[PDB]
């Protein structure tokens, strides 16, 4: 099928300039005894206009929408395919494109082919017209900065946490833990699985959470933010939770973000939040993604691809990991993921992308961070225009959750001032106490801290 | 954490009899330098009530809902976890459980832990009360048999296809292609990506397809079935397509199945079809699943787990592959996947499951099949109470799509009669002509066929 | 839905699960919410199944919003004490389609994790096919209890 579904003489520069194709770059390894080009061509066919044999029903018009392999490097195990724009599904309702079609064609059936050892998407290019037909984000970090009374341009670090334990707190205990963090921090979110468990019903816990928000706001003089999980199988269940949340928070309802477990939940749930509640910050939680985005995986698509898709879907923010600075699987090069979702112009691993003013998706950092690890994280990224949720780093603090929230903020102020963390600790109590809260991390990152800070009987 | 999130003295037999836990069996390999139990215990914690450090907010009540490792085999790389039922989310609207919560906890964050090399679910057990709170299927194959005028019990083989090419046919060509197959076959479905492309809009093609269904019904005197793709990001787009489909088919609207790309589309799209249009057969298409279900994968979950979940979600039927008899990745032991979704009582790789009358999900066979390959597939499976869609096997036939449909039916009749395929071909032209349509398959499966068939 | 779904909830064989004990709340009209809830609790200590009498709904002396949460408390209390599941069949009969749905929605929300144990009773003969289909099509996952009040006006042995 090489003759029909491959044209290795096409120039990528031309395919991009034309603006008539979505381009996709994969890593690929063919099965034993299978030629590399024929594998790529079969993938292109199975991912667009054909199957594994000739069919009587094929006409010449069909060939015009064939996906085409325009580049392969067998030595490097790379293949690139051009997908004509007209292949992708459109809403009958409003003509917009849908991400589920992109997934179906470009990373659907080709993941189960017997003649393919493995196939993973590394990057993709979206031309101007296709980008115009995606929803894109309706809210972004600047809306949160505005609420917090900080500059809508470069408003900087937003301190946050997840309520701990991840499951098991009853309504009153849950509301109290929320209150305690907000005395020092900006941002609280449900842990990914917390919803309407029988031991902590939503109708009971949420009004109490709002009371905690009000009390913290009155006492601190600062606005507070809450990100609520509305993930659910039933579309109308999602809307029921959402409707109840906004009514409950009343005059502070703009401060309610909606969290959706978008990876295991799928594009449907993300779009429900985005289209039915565009005026609420949409928080994309990627739980489960590791099953394909892991460094050891040669299937599906990468974390980078996921983040870039989420921006098109209309996520206000998305988890991008800790880039090797915490407890999940990530490395320092993952900073490109944040750049791609927050900048108007950025170059991915294979494709440069212009966003033409589409709103930025906030990079949200979570997973094993604390005040001691943050200075190193910020140095790698180059800035702090982020939301940083730290469950362990906050509730794990020896003094209080509030002190934990403060320690996170002081760590950012330390890095921003370009100061020495140990010396910074000498003038910032909460930050200093984080060393004693997480001594194993302290010994590794800042050896000799006990001696320098006078932490001894 | 081992002391808290593992109790290897718990008896699995007791955990099952109690009916208070969902049990899950994984393959697991810890990261380098990490002990197996400490890995397992950490996995249990991250999948329920805790994190990687102690927190001041922990109370004693939280421990009662801790997930517990109750079994490990470091040598075989197996671990099993008991998840208390109360952990899982419930609708405020109607109290039922949701599959996305099961996914979030049992195969969510645990796929990205740095101290875990890999982790994949092999099987799970659902106790009676949790099962009562799942939607389950509302329609099944017996509903199709009833329409087709066949016994609602063991109605047997349903011949089918996918329209080929998978993308690109315009409305009139598309509808004409549909008509040609139905002259011989029962069942047509959209290929997984076909919807409202600009070269073939739904409002244009669907009325033409219905015309094709009517012409074939009048001419064959047999009822026909069509499975339409309604997959879409927007819930209300799905409903727009569904509403239009039912109105268009009018008095035959009961013969319309709704196809959903449930893996890439997610539980949200499946439940939209299941709950808003329960009286329509819901066809679960598993496009994308190979990224975790592949034999080469050590992450996510297996095809078996996926299929078992789909039944809980309320799929009327789901793709289960060709079990090593076609072009995708599958083997003969995959027949257990079909058994688990269609039987009332079956034993999985790790757990026996009673279904207590929940409707069976139809095993749908698709992917590189033709009349020559079917006899081997049926012998392995043991029956033909299946829907078999063959795109290439049908439109690939040298004579016609109708002839292709007949050859598929004749292949089932051959196996059912326990006949020799080469000798069966001597009395069935359509079946015989399938040898010439796919000579390469013919040479492998039936060497010397050219001489015997002349 | 059918009786096998009820057998399943009750933990009995889904095939030939046998006798389901039940009752109607007495007096047929007149109990206030607390008295009504108490009567429900008392039967459920021994029985499986309770249903509204055919006319009981939202009378001014016993509003639905008041009584239904109390009935659910009684169902829970009986379940906890007997270790047996209990069933309740609620009248949602009403002229207005949207009144029926309001009652149905409120009932399922109220019963929360036990909402599958709520049946919907419809006075189908005097109420007509419209009301029956409303329950059947808008709430198919809830057991539909057809009450034939009024039927005797034509079905009587004396009727021709
Ligand atoms: O459940 C958890 O583990 C977290 O709350 C982190 O808690 P801690 O702050 O206590 O570690 C986050 O949901 C994960 O980090 C998500 O991972 P990611 O952002 O990589 O997708
Ligand atoms: O798109 C296709 O390739 C098919 O129409 C097969 O066409 P052919 O009959 O022409 O091969 C099916 O969708 C796949 O088999 C799905 O795979 P699975 O059932 O394994 O999920
Ligand atoms: Mg979490
Ligand atoms: Mg297909
Ligand atoms: Mg009565």
mmCIF file of N, CA and C in Angstrom, chain A residues 46 48-49 51 56-57 61-62 86-87 89-93 99-100 104-105 108-109 111-112 114 164-170 192 196-197 199 233-237 241 264-265 267 271 275-276 288 290-291 294 299 327-329 392 395, chain B residues 46 48-49 51 53 56-57 59 61-62 86-87 89-93 98-100 104 108-109 111-112 114 164-168 170 192-193 196-197 199 233-237 241 261 264-265 267 271 275 288 290-291 294 299 327-329 395:
data_model
loop_
_atom_site.group_PDB
_atom_site.id
_atom_site.type_symbol
_atom_site.label_atom_id
_atom_site.label_comp_id
_atom_site.label_asym_id
_atom_site.label_seq_id
_atom_site.Cartn_x
_atom_site.Cartn_y
_atom_site.Cartn_z
ATOM 1 N N UNK A 46 -5.022 2.585 7.485
ATOM 2 C CA UNK A 46 -5.911 2.181 8.566
ATOM 3 C C UNK A 46 -6.370 3.384 9.394
ATOM 4 N N UNK A 48 -7.171 6.354 8.032
ATOM 5 C CA UNK A 48 -7.939 7.267 7.187
ATOM 6 C C UNK A 48 -8.973 6.571 6.293
ATOM 7 N N UNK A 49 -8.604 6.363 5.031
ATOM 8 C CA UNK A 49 -9.550 5.957 3.993
ATOM 9 C C UNK A 49 -9.622 4.473 3.611
ATOM 10 N N UNK A 51 -8.456 -0.086 4.342
ATOM 11 C CA UNK A 51 -8.307 -1.294 5.143
ATOM 12 C C UNK A 51 -7.156 -2.150 4.593
ATOM 13 N N UNK A 56 -14.104 -2.950 -3.722
ATOM 14 C CA UNK A 56 -14.732 -2.544 -4.975
ATOM 15 C C UNK A 56 -15.289 -1.126 -4.923
ATOM 16 N N UNK A 57 -15.565 -0.648 -3.716
ATOM 17 C CA UNK A 57 -16.281 0.605 -3.533
ATOM 18 C C UNK A 57 -15.394 1.846 -3.590
ATOM 19 N N UNK A 61 -12.411 9.871 -5.862
ATOM 20 C CA UNK A 61 -12.566 11.000 -4.958
ATOM 21 C C UNK A 61 -11.955 10.624 -3.610
ATOM 22 N N UNK A 62 -12.113 9.358 -3.222
ATOM 23 C CA UNK A 62 -11.638 8.901 -1.922
ATOM 24 C C UNK A 62 -10.134 9.094 -1.745
ATOM 25 N N UNK A 86 -10.334 17.694 5.813
ATOM 26 C CA UNK A 86 -11.713 17.290 5.536
ATOM 27 C C UNK A 86 -12.073 15.928 6.122
ATOM 28 N N UNK A 87 -11.066 15.181 6.559
ATOM 29 C CA UNK A 87 -11.288 13.882 7.177
ATOM 30 C C UNK A 87 -12.037 13.991 8.506
ATOM 31 N N UNK A 89 -14.376 15.021 11.738
ATOM 32 C CA UNK A 89 -15.800 15.202 11.972
ATOM 33 C C UNK A 89 -16.141 16.618 12.411
ATOM 34 N N UNK A 90 -17.351 17.042 12.053
ATOM 35 C CA UNK A 90 -17.853 18.381 12.342
ATOM 36 C C UNK A 90 -19.218 18.301 12.997
ATOM 37 N N UNK A 91 -19.467 19.158 13.980
ATOM 38 C CA UNK A 91 -20.788 19.223 14.590
ATOM 39 C C UNK A 91 -21.827 19.648 13.557
ATOM 40 N N UNK A 92 -22.959 18.958 13.535
ATOM 41 C CA UNK A 92 -24.079 19.406 12.731
ATOM 42 C C UNK A 92 -24.668 20.668 13.343
ATOM 43 N N UNK A 93 -24.500 20.806 14.654
ATOM 44 C CA UNK A 93 -25.085 21.914 15.398
ATOM 45 C C UNK A 93 -24.409 23.258 15.156
ATOM 46 N N UNK A 99 -12.300 16.806 19.123
ATOM 47 C CA UNK A 99 -11.027 16.159 19.422
ATOM 48 C C UNK A 99 -11.137 14.640 19.347
ATOM 49 N N UNK A 100 -12.334 14.116 19.580
ATOM 50 C CA UNK A 100 -12.539 12.672 19.573
ATOM 51 C C UNK A 100 -12.307 12.091 18.178
ATOM 52 N N UNK A 104 -9.717 9.219 17.154
ATOM 53 C CA UNK A 104 -10.204 8.040 16.445
ATOM 54 C C UNK A 104 -9.338 7.729 15.232
ATOM 55 N N UNK A 105 -9.060 8.748 14.427
ATOM 56 C CA UNK A 105 -8.300 8.559 13.198
ATOM 57 C C UNK A 105 -6.805 8.385 13.455
ATOM 58 N N UNK A 108 -6.286 5.682 16.867
ATOM 59 C CA UNK A 108 -7.326 4.710 17.158
ATOM 60 C C UNK A 108 -6.945 3.281 16.804
ATOM 61 N N UNK A 109 -7.514 2.773 15.718
ATOM 62 C CA UNK A 109 -7.292 1.395 15.292
ATOM 63 C C UNK A 109 -5.822 1.022 15.070
ATOM 64 N N UNK A 111 -3.426 1.337 16.891
ATOM 65 C CA UNK A 111 -2.798 0.897 18.134
ATOM 66 C C UNK A 111 -2.942 -0.602 18.364
ATOM 67 N N UNK A 112 -3.706 -1.275 17.508
ATOM 68 C CA UNK A 112 -3.964 -2.696 17.672
ATOM 69 C C UNK A 112 -3.602 -3.542 16.463
ATOM 70 N N UNK A 114 -1.573 -5.981 14.051
ATOM 71 C CA UNK A 114 -0.722 -7.134 14.291
ATOM 72 C C UNK A 114 0.644 -6.999 13.653
ATOM 73 N N UNK A 164 -6.247 16.545 52.018
ATOM 74 C CA UNK A 164 -5.677 15.275 52.473
ATOM 75 C C UNK A 164 -6.388 14.835 53.751
ATOM 76 N N UNK A 165 -6.750 13.555 53.890
ATOM 77 C CA UNK A 165 -6.642 12.368 53.042
ATOM 78 C C UNK A 165 -7.462 12.461 51.780
ATOM 79 N N UNK A 166 -7.066 11.698 50.772
ATOM 80 C CA UNK A 166 -7.654 11.860 49.465
ATOM 81 C C UNK A 166 -9.077 11.342 49.478
ATOM 82 N N UNK A 167 -9.322 10.297 50.246
ATOM 83 C CA UNK A 167 -10.681 9.875 50.529
ATOM 84 C C UNK A 167 -10.826 9.592 52.021
ATOM 85 N N UNK A 168 -11.993 9.883 52.583
ATOM 86 C CA UNK A 168 -12.286 9.518 53.959
ATOM 87 C C UNK A 168 -12.697 10.609 54.924
ATOM 88 N N UNK A 169 -12.405 11.869 54.626
ATOM 89 C CA UNK A 169 -12.820 12.916 55.542
ATOM 90 C C UNK A 169 -14.336 13.101 55.451
ATOM 91 N N UNK A 170 -14.981 13.255 56.601
ATOM 92 C CA UNK A 170 -16.410 13.557 56.683
ATOM 93 C C UNK A 170 -16.623 15.053 56.427
ATOM 94 N N UNK A 192 -8.642 14.202 43.160
ATOM 95 C CA UNK A 192 -9.328 13.723 41.947
ATOM 96 C C UNK A 192 -10.531 12.770 42.139
ATOM 97 N N UNK A 196 -19.256 12.586 45.771
ATOM 98 C CA UNK A 196 -20.467 12.383 46.565
ATOM 99 C C UNK A 196 -20.447 11.023 47.275
ATOM 100 N N UNK A 197 -19.318 10.662 47.878
ATOM 101 C CA UNK A 197 -19.255 9.430 48.666
ATOM 102 C C UNK A 197 -20.264 9.464 49.821
ATOM 103 N N UNK A 199 -20.096 8.782 52.834
ATOM 104 C CA UNK A 199 -19.582 9.278 54.108
ATOM 105 C C UNK A 199 -19.302 10.785 54.056
ATOM 106 N N UNK A 233 -20.184 10.083 35.126
ATOM 107 C CA UNK A 233 -20.649 9.406 33.916
ATOM 108 C C UNK A 233 -21.803 10.160 33.249
ATOM 109 N N UNK A 234 -22.822 10.506 34.034
ATOM 110 C CA UNK A 234 -24.025 11.130 33.492
ATOM 111 C C UNK A 234 -23.815 12.631 33.313
ATOM 112 N N UNK A 235 -23.958 13.087 32.074
ATOM 113 C CA UNK A 235 -23.885 14.501 31.736
ATOM 114 C C UNK A 235 -24.739 15.345 32.678
ATOM 115 N N UNK A 236 -25.937 14.858 32.970
ATOM 116 C CA UNK A 236 -26.887 15.599 33.791
ATOM 117 C C UNK A 236 -26.534 15.530 35.273
ATOM 118 N N UNK A 237 -25.722 14.544 35.649
ATOM 119 C CA UNK A 237 -25.161 14.498 36.996
ATOM 120 C C UNK A 237 -24.118 15.603 37.149
ATOM 121 N N UNK A 241 -24.345 18.800 39.850
ATOM 122 C CA UNK A 241 -23.319 19.192 40.810
ATOM 123 C C UNK A 241 -22.882 20.635 40.588
ATOM 124 N N UNK A 264 -9.432 9.704 32.043
ATOM 125 C CA UNK A 264 -10.282 8.528 32.234
ATOM 126 C C UNK A 264 -11.740 8.870 31.934
ATOM 127 N N UNK A 265 -12.083 10.149 32.073
ATOM 128 C CA UNK A 265 -13.441 10.618 31.850
ATOM 129 C C UNK A 265 -13.739 10.863 30.381
ATOM 130 N N UNK A 267 -13.123 13.226 26.487
ATOM 131 C CA UNK A 267 -13.444 14.546 25.926
ATOM 132 C C UNK A 267 -14.876 14.997 26.203
ATOM 133 N N UNK A 271 -15.849 18.683 27.590
ATOM 134 C CA UNK A 271 -16.659 19.566 26.759
ATOM 135 C C UNK A 271 -17.945 19.966 27.472
ATOM 136 N N UNK A 275 -18.546 23.869 27.612
ATOM 137 C CA UNK A 275 -19.643 24.445 26.842
ATOM 138 C C UNK A 275 -20.847 24.852 27.693
ATOM 139 N N UNK A 276 -21.103 24.129 28.781
ATOM 140 C CA UNK A 276 -22.246 24.435 29.644
ATOM 141 C C UNK A 276 -21.891 25.426 30.749
ATOM 142 N N UNK A 288 -4.574 8.870 35.340
ATOM 143 C CA UNK A 288 -4.574 7.709 34.465
ATOM 144 C C UNK A 288 -3.633 7.828 33.277
ATOM 145 N N UNK A 290 -0.617 8.170 32.793
ATOM 146 C CA UNK A 290 0.659 7.477 32.845
ATOM 147 C C UNK A 290 0.658 6.147 32.118
ATOM 148 N N UNK A 291 -0.527 5.599 31.872
ATOM 149 C CA UNK A 291 -0.630 4.304 31.222
ATOM 150 C C UNK A 291 -0.130 4.401 29.774
ATOM 151 N N UNK A 294 3.909 7.536 30.112
ATOM 152 C CA UNK A 294 5.115 7.125 30.823
ATOM 153 C C UNK A 294 6.313 7.042 29.872
ATOM 154 N N UNK A 299 3.472 3.480 23.267
ATOM 155 C CA UNK A 299 2.122 3.455 22.709
ATOM 156 C C UNK A 299 1.328 4.708 23.075
ATOM 157 N N UNK A 327 7.282 13.361 42.850
ATOM 158 C CA UNK A 327 7.094 11.913 42.994
ATOM 159 C C UNK A 327 6.587 11.132 41.790
ATOM 160 N N UNK A 328 6.194 11.819 40.724
ATOM 161 C CA UNK A 328 5.725 11.136 39.525
ATOM 162 C C UNK A 328 6.865 10.958 38.515
ATOM 163 N N UNK A 329 6.520 10.520 37.310
ATOM 164 C CA UNK A 329 7.478 10.291 36.228
ATOM 165 C C UNK A 329 7.482 11.513 35.327
ATOM 166 N N UNK A 392 0.776 17.044 50.376
ATOM 167 C CA UNK A 392 1.705 16.614 51.398
ATOM 168 C C UNK A 392 2.509 17.787 51.905
ATOM 169 N N UNK A 395 -0.273 19.934 54.381
ATOM 170 C CA UNK A 395 -0.786 19.258 55.569
ATOM 171 C C UNK A 395 0.330 18.477 56.266
ATOM 172 N N UNK B 46 -2.113 5.380 47.333
ATOM 173 C CA UNK B 46 -2.323 6.385 46.301
ATOM 174 C C UNK B 46 -3.642 6.152 45.564
ATOM 175 N N UNK B 48 -6.466 5.213 47.102
ATOM 176 C CA UNK B 48 -7.580 5.360 48.035
ATOM 177 C C UNK B 48 -7.449 6.587 48.945
ATOM 178 N N UNK B 49 -6.976 6.350 50.164
ATOM 179 C CA UNK B 49 -7.031 7.338 51.238
ATOM 180 C C UNK B 49 -5.782 8.172 51.556
ATOM 181 N N UNK B 51 -1.395 9.727 50.606
ATOM 182 C CA UNK B 51 -0.363 10.302 49.757
ATOM 183 C C UNK B 51 1.005 9.804 50.232
ATOM 184 N N UNK B 53 3.209 11.188 52.208
ATOM 185 C CA UNK B 53 3.621 11.593 53.553
ATOM 186 C C UNK B 53 2.443 11.564 54.511
ATOM 187 N N UNK B 56 -1.663 15.871 59.061
ATOM 188 C CA UNK B 56 -2.283 16.145 60.353
ATOM 189 C C UNK B 56 -3.784 15.875 60.362
ATOM 190 N N UNK B 57 -4.401 15.883 59.184
ATOM 191 C CA UNK B 57 -5.859 15.819 59.070
ATOM 192 C C UNK B 57 -6.410 14.394 59.126
ATOM 193 N N UNK B 59 -7.833 11.082 60.361
ATOM 194 C CA UNK B 59 -8.546 10.573 61.526
ATOM 195 C C UNK B 59 -8.689 9.060 61.436
ATOM 196 N N UNK B 61 -11.408 7.355 61.285
ATOM 197 C CA UNK B 61 -12.493 6.932 60.420
ATOM 198 C C UNK B 61 -11.923 6.654 59.031
ATOM 199 N N UNK B 62 -10.940 7.450 58.608
ATOM 200 C CA UNK B 62 -10.385 7.301 57.263
ATOM 201 C C UNK B 62 -9.797 5.912 57.017
ATOM 202 N N UNK B 86 -17.580 1.820 49.791
ATOM 203 C CA UNK B 86 -17.953 3.200 50.104
ATOM 204 C C UNK B 86 -17.008 4.239 49.504
ATOM 205 N N UNK B 87 -15.856 3.799 49.016
ATOM 206 C CA UNK B 87 -14.912 4.713 48.390
ATOM 207 C C UNK B 87 -15.464 5.327 47.108
ATOM 208 N N UNK B 89 -17.755 6.849 44.057
ATOM 209 C CA UNK B 89 -18.682 7.966 43.918
ATOM 210 C C UNK B 89 -20.082 7.497 43.530
ATOM 211 N N UNK B 90 -21.074 8.262 43.967
ATOM 212 C CA UNK B 90 -22.480 7.963 43.739
ATOM 213 C C UNK B 90 -23.178 9.196 43.165
ATOM 214 N N UNK B 91 -24.088 9.003 42.215
ATOM 215 C CA UNK B 91 -24.873 10.118 41.689
ATOM 216 C C UNK B 91 -25.729 10.744 42.782
ATOM 217 N N UNK B 92 -25.723 12.070 42.835
ATOM 218 C CA UNK B 92 -26.639 12.790 43.698
ATOM 219 C C UNK B 92 -28.055 12.665 43.155
ATOM 220 N N UNK B 93 -28.158 12.474 41.841
ATOM 221 C CA UNK B 93 -29.452 12.414 41.177
ATOM 222 C C UNK B 93 -30.200 11.113 41.456
ATOM 223 N N UNK B 98 -20.592 5.024 39.258
ATOM 224 C CA UNK B 98 -20.076 5.479 37.976
ATOM 225 C C UNK B 98 -18.716 4.852 37.712
ATOM 226 N N UNK B 99 -18.513 4.414 36.477
ATOM 227 C CA UNK B 99 -17.301 3.697 36.112
ATOM 228 C C UNK B 99 -16.067 4.586 36.170
ATOM 229 N N UNK B 100 -16.254 5.888 35.974
ATOM 230 C CA UNK B 100 -15.125 6.811 35.974
ATOM 231 C C UNK B 100 -14.463 6.896 37.365
ATOM 232 N N UNK B 104 -10.679 6.170 38.182
ATOM 233 C CA UNK B 104 -9.870 7.170 38.874
ATOM 234 C C UNK B 104 -9.059 6.552 40.006
ATOM 235 N N UNK B 108 -5.860 5.072 38.082
ATOM 236 C CA UNK B 108 -5.614 6.483 37.828
ATOM 237 C C UNK B 108 -4.194 6.938 38.118
ATOM 238 N N UNK B 109 -4.021 7.655 39.224
ATOM 239 C CA UNK B 109 -2.728 8.215 39.608
ATOM 240 C C UNK B 109 -1.636 7.166 39.718
ATOM 241 N N UNK B 111 -0.673 5.066 37.746
ATOM 242 C CA UNK B 111 0.012 4.804 36.489
ATOM 243 C C UNK B 111 1.219 5.716 36.288
ATOM 244 N N UNK B 112 1.402 6.688 37.178
ATOM 245 C CA UNK B 112 2.491 7.637 37.030
ATOM 246 C C UNK B 112 3.424 7.750 38.222
ATOM 247 N N UNK B 114 6.634 7.285 40.490
ATOM 248 C CA UNK B 114 8.041 7.147 40.168
ATOM 249 C C UNK B 114 8.652 5.888 40.753
ATOM 250 N N UNK B 164 -16.911 0.442 3.364
ATOM 251 C CA UNK B 164 -15.558 0.639 2.852
ATOM 252 C C UNK B 164 -15.637 1.523 1.612
ATOM 253 N N UNK B 165 -14.755 2.522 1.463
ATOM 254 C CA UNK B 165 -13.637 3.034 2.258
ATOM 255 C C UNK B 165 -14.077 3.632 3.575
ATOM 256 N N UNK B 166 -13.161 3.679 4.532
ATOM 257 C CA UNK B 166 -13.528 4.040 5.882
ATOM 258 C C UNK B 166 -13.857 5.522 5.927
ATOM 259 N N UNK B 167 -13.158 6.318 5.133
ATOM 260 C CA UNK B 167 -13.551 7.701 4.898
ATOM 261 C C UNK B 167 -13.487 8.051 3.416
ATOM 262 N N UNK B 168 -14.402 8.901 2.967
ATOM 263 C CA UNK B 168 -14.353 9.431 1.616
ATOM 264 C C UNK B 168 -15.550 9.249 0.710
ATOM 265 N N UNK B 170 -19.062 9.841 -0.793
ATOM 266 C CA UNK B 170 -20.090 10.878 -0.778
ATOM 267 C C UNK B 170 -21.442 10.213 -0.507
ATOM 268 N N UNK B 192 -15.681 3.432 12.219
ATOM 269 C CA UNK B 192 -15.602 4.221 13.465
ATOM 270 C C UNK B 192 -15.462 5.748 13.312
ATOM 271 N N UNK B 193 -14.830 6.244 12.232
ATOM 272 C CA UNK B 193 -14.653 7.695 12.094
ATOM 273 C C UNK B 193 -15.728 8.425 11.274
ATOM 274 N N UNK B 196 -20.121 13.384 10.193
ATOM 275 C CA UNK B 196 -20.641 14.540 9.467
ATOM 276 C C UNK B 196 -19.520 15.246 8.704
ATOM 277 N N UNK B 197 -18.663 14.486 8.030
ATOM 278 C CA UNK B 197 -17.634 15.092 7.191
ATOM 279 C C UNK B 197 -18.254 15.949 6.098
ATOM 280 N N UNK B 199 -17.729 16.226 3.049
ATOM 281 C CA UNK B 199 -17.955 15.561 1.768
ATOM 282 C C UNK B 199 -19.071 14.529 1.898
ATOM 283 N N UNK B 233 -17.900 15.203 20.917
ATOM 284 C CA UNK B 233 -17.481 15.900 22.131
ATOM 285 C C UNK B 233 -18.684 16.438 22.896
ATOM 286 N N UNK B 234 -19.557 17.148 22.187
ATOM 287 C CA UNK B 234 -20.698 17.812 22.804
ATOM 288 C C UNK B 234 -21.826 16.810 22.986
ATOM 289 N N UNK B 235 -22.232 16.631 24.236
ATOM 290 C CA UNK B 235 -23.361 15.786 24.595
ATOM 291 C C UNK B 235 -24.582 16.072 23.709
ATOM 292 N N UNK B 236 -24.841 17.352 23.468
ATOM 293 C CA UNK B 236 -26.022 17.769 22.724
ATOM 294 C C UNK B 236 -25.883 17.557 21.212
ATOM 295 N N UNK B 237 -24.647 17.416 20.735
ATOM 296 C CA UNK B 237 -24.393 17.010 19.352
ATOM 297 C C UNK B 237 -24.768 15.539 19.167
ATOM 298 N N UNK B 241 -27.707 14.115 16.593
ATOM 299 C CA UNK B 241 -27.541 13.057 15.612
ATOM 300 C C UNK B 241 -28.509 11.916 15.875
ATOM 301 N N UNK B 261 -17.654 5.440 20.097
ATOM 302 C CA UNK B 261 -16.226 5.190 20.312
ATOM 303 C C UNK B 261 -15.900 5.387 21.792
ATOM 304 N N UNK B 264 -11.772 6.118 23.325
ATOM 305 C CA UNK B 264 -11.257 7.463 23.082
ATOM 306 C C UNK B 264 -12.312 8.504 23.450
ATOM 307 N N UNK B 265 -13.580 8.103 23.408
ATOM 308 C CA UNK B 265 -14.679 9.006 23.706
ATOM 309 C C UNK B 265 -14.937 9.142 25.193
ATOM 310 N N UNK B 267 -16.348 7.334 29.162
ATOM 311 C CA UNK B 267 -17.610 6.907 29.777
ATOM 312 C C UNK B 267 -18.749 7.899 29.582
ATOM 313 N N UNK B 271 -22.477 6.782 28.371
ATOM 314 C CA UNK B 271 -23.618 6.947 29.259
ATOM 315 C C UNK B 271 -24.684 7.835 28.621
ATOM 316 N N UNK B 275 -28.207 6.168 28.644
ATOM 317 C CA UNK B 275 -29.245 6.744 29.494
ATOM 318 C C UNK B 275 -30.293 7.576 28.750
ATOM 319 N N UNK B 288 -8.685 2.561 19.667
ATOM 320 C CA UNK B 288 -7.658 3.128 20.522
ATOM 321 C C UNK B 288 -7.181 2.211 21.639
ATOM 322 N N UNK B 290 -5.813 -0.535 21.924
ATOM 323 C CA UNK B 290 -4.546 -1.235 21.795
ATOM 324 C C UNK B 290 -3.383 -0.564 22.503
ATOM 325 N N UNK B 291 -3.527 0.723 22.813
ATOM 326 C CA UNK B 291 -2.449 1.470 23.453
ATOM 327 C C UNK B 291 -2.190 0.948 24.872
ATOM 328 N N UNK B 294 -2.760 -4.144 24.353
ATOM 329 C CA UNK B 294 -1.820 -4.928 23.571
ATOM 330 C C UNK B 294 -1.070 -5.941 24.438
ATOM 331 N N UNK B 299 0.871 -1.800 31.133
ATOM 332 C CA UNK B 299 0.225 -0.658 31.785
ATOM 333 C C UNK B 299 -1.266 -0.609 31.495
ATOM 334 N N UNK B 327 -6.425 -9.606 11.675
ATOM 335 C CA UNK B 327 -5.331 -8.648 11.482
ATOM 336 C C UNK B 327 -4.903 -7.819 12.680
ATOM 337 N N UNK B 328 -5.639 -7.906 13.778
ATOM 338 C CA UNK B 328 -5.278 -7.172 14.980
ATOM 339 C C UNK B 328 -4.459 -8.069 15.911
ATOM 340 N N UNK B 329 -4.222 -7.595 17.129
ATOM 341 C CA UNK B 329 -3.450 -8.318 18.144
ATOM 342 C C UNK B 329 -4.407 -9.043 19.081
ATOM 343 N N UNK B 395 -16.735 -6.230 0.802
ATOM 344 C CA UNK B 395 -16.487 -5.377 -0.355
ATOM 345 C C UNK B 395 -15.275 -5.857 -1.147
#
